[PDB]
């Protein structure tokens, strides 16, 4: 993309778990309706939140390893990482407005 980290099983530790800041990970798949529905929305958020957090996308079919370690079932699942630790969790789609509220409240 441009600002979105395109994650893999092998880059997860470095990209997410080792990052000095907040990472908003999207677990998601090509066939998933709601994932695709929010994909443009993650684009918007990556812009508005520059220097506050980085957005990262793990497609859980091309990267099957990492999902089971966070007990993911329902997709999309958005996970806020704070310096490699999960602060917050949202399952399913939500609008841009609903995601602002989530981040703003959990980034504090």
Distance of CA 22 to the CA centre of its chain: 10
Nearest to 12 by CA among 1, 2, 30, 26: 26
Domain spans in the chain, listed from the N-terminal domain onward:
1-108
Resolution (A): 2.6
> What is the distance of C-alpha 105 from the center of its chain?
16
Q: Distance between CA atoms of 23 and 85, rounded to whole angstroms?
A: 9
DSSP-derived secondary structure for 63-89:
--SSGGGGT--SSSEEEEEETTEEEEE
Distance CA 20, CA 26 (A): 18
Does domain 1-108 fall into CATH 3.40.50.720? no
Cα distances (angstroms) measured from residue 29 to each of 7, 47, 57, 97: 13, 22, 10, 23
**Residues designated catalytic:** 32, 35
The SS3 assignment for 50 reads: coil
């Amino acid at each position: 993309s441009d600002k979105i980290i395109h994650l893999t099983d092998d880059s997860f530790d470095t990209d997410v778990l080792k990052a000095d800041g907040a990472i908003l990970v999207d677990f998601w798949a090509e066939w998933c309706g709601p994932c695709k529905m929010i994909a443009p929305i993650l684009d918007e958020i990556a812009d508005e939140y520059q220097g506050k957090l980085t957005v990262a996308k793990l497609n859980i079919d091309q990267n099957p390893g990492t999902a089971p370690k966070y007990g993911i079932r329902g997709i999309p699942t958005l996970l806020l990482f704070k310096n490699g630790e999960v602060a917050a969790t949202k399952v399913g789609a939500l609008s841009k407005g609903q995601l602002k509220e989530f981040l703003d409240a959990n980034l504090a």
